[PDB]
Amino acid sequence: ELAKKIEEEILNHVREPQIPDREVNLLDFGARGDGRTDCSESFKRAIEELSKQGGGRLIVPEGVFLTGPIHLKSNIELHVKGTIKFIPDPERYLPVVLTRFEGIELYNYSPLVYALDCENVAITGSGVLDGSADNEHWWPWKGKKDFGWKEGLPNQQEDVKKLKEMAERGTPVEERVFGKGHYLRPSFVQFYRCRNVLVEGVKIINSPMWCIHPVLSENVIIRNIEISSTGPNNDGIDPESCKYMLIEKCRFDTGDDSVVIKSGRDADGRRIGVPSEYILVRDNLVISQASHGGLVIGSEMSGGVRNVVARNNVYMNVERALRLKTNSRRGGYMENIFFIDNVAVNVSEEVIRINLRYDNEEGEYLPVVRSVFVKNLKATGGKYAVRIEGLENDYVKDILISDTIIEGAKISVLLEFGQLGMENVIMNGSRFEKLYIEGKALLK
Template structure:
């Protein structure tokens, strides 16, 4: 089966949700479009009623609506019309009670994501409106490092990771009130047939769109904006059959990061991310355009990134793969083709096993079958940079029919076995497989 056929097969497996022709306007349940009164209860009542009625569309009309945490349920589409803004509360208490979630790849009970769904099927967030998490340098983001006179997440983060390494039961990993682990924005957890389409998502406390253990996910035509710490754009984690297309990213961290759990917890759950299609997206600021890792202990298989455009001096890398021997995992069959990079800061192609802890663990990462074809890029420090272990070299690296221009260092290859370069030009020089 050709790559084109493999990608088409994945796309054909993805099923869009379908909803009954019923409408539930949130203002009919008492929602305040002036942005003054708390509309959480009205929104949730509309969602609950649509769910009880067998499904339908919950409509948010023009206006500004202030809410806390919302729980999306099966067979419900949350439709945010153009000129409608859902402005989320900055009060952490409005995201209680705690729910089962993941923080940086580790399961726990924590503040609810701003929009959360658990074991739901046939759900959607659509429309031309805006979802504003309203995080900023005075709200949520300071928890990252304890800035602006606010507490830091450091102690809680260390405690959670230590619990996971000791295999403490998830039900005993209770955080939330009195703790400082930031919630994600949109998180369907163990859901099927998920659609997020057309909306603008901005200013999340941290990761912005974060499907976990989901199957059949479509993210289409979404604008994802946010320049706070860890404000990744879309992070499918331990998900199967996902397409991310026609989106615009401008982020403080990775634009798209494919994940599958961190360290012992990722190995305990042991569900890879597989069959991910990333196509026709525009990427500006971020640590990486298309990233795999670093919370990747469950592995990843079959990632197709095609026809994406990247252009920002504040974009660090185009294709980024990051793991180490603490993370482990098998990362394989990653295809990056027909992508255009007009500007970026650091590496065009980066595979890094020295990320964070480096070679400090017992879980050998495996990185293999990474293919780049018809790439055109300008700018950056490195063209191709691979930092792998001598006991686990990268295999199956192939770069063909590509032009990488304007880089300071064409290649740095540390422990790559038999790479294949064909019709690859870097700074105007042709590189074949035997040259480095």
């Protein structure tokens, strides 16, 4: 069976980064943990000194260290004992760097921790990364009053429209310059085209937008971290066009999707043409009323997503346990998605959701969505246990749910333009030894 094979494959290619046996303390570079001194230059000097010697471990001791963005280099481990608190002043995140906003490449404000074309990079320790985002910093740019936007203040809407247009017209990335005078938030922790990446131990809070965002990266390990940030688009981990990645033993409380697998949006995503594949998500804990999904694929999946195993996770209070979202603007594919031995309780919206009408957007690139496997799920709550919606000319195919119990969902199955198999499934006052349906169905 495929799920064990995929896990075995992932585990054969996932490896901790090599970090030179050499360490340096941030205090020796004039930094002060007084939550007052600007430590920007300290980080710059310590990292540059380490990488001239071939790399190494930078120790950030107990205390609160204020800084602008941190730019990592190859062979560098950032070891956080205290708190790194970022200064929420957009000018500090200039000049513009190569980055990505909601699946489209551009030049924009630096992520708060940024590594480009690097190898063997680590963030470790049991300290804190504090993005300093709140109702007065970064978050108003969303344009939601819930988060500090008001009439007469700028927001991201016009810039998002321009960005989608530029990518539609296939303009070169270098031509897509935002930064100053524009309102597109950066990612928090971003590895861009990196190899051999480790993020462990740390707690992430007050994030501007997406928290951990590896892009076009290979051999990535995220373990034993805590995400606690519930602002607008505060996704937990967004693997985007990544290959061979392990996410384990993490704690999530997110303002949006918790673990969200991506690979670029529309034309830009199809241009790059790199899928996310061989991702293992296991032994994680989501306790989050604000989370939009425990395990999420899309909507930016135009490069494809396949061979994803999510196993032995616990989801509590989330809106959705498993969520796949796409539309006919995206193209691409989502296939061989395994959601196994999970527990999802007090789900508020849909336990399992597959949606091919995301944002009600349409175009001429029909996504392939097939081979999604749910086995040994114990779940509780929801407006829907199972909600699967394809298109008249693009059915959701080969969806199988087995050995599963979902209690207290209002509607058992909403199916439109899909094929669904269920084997040994229990839903409230209904039990299915074997169910197969192709077409449309409503079960409650």
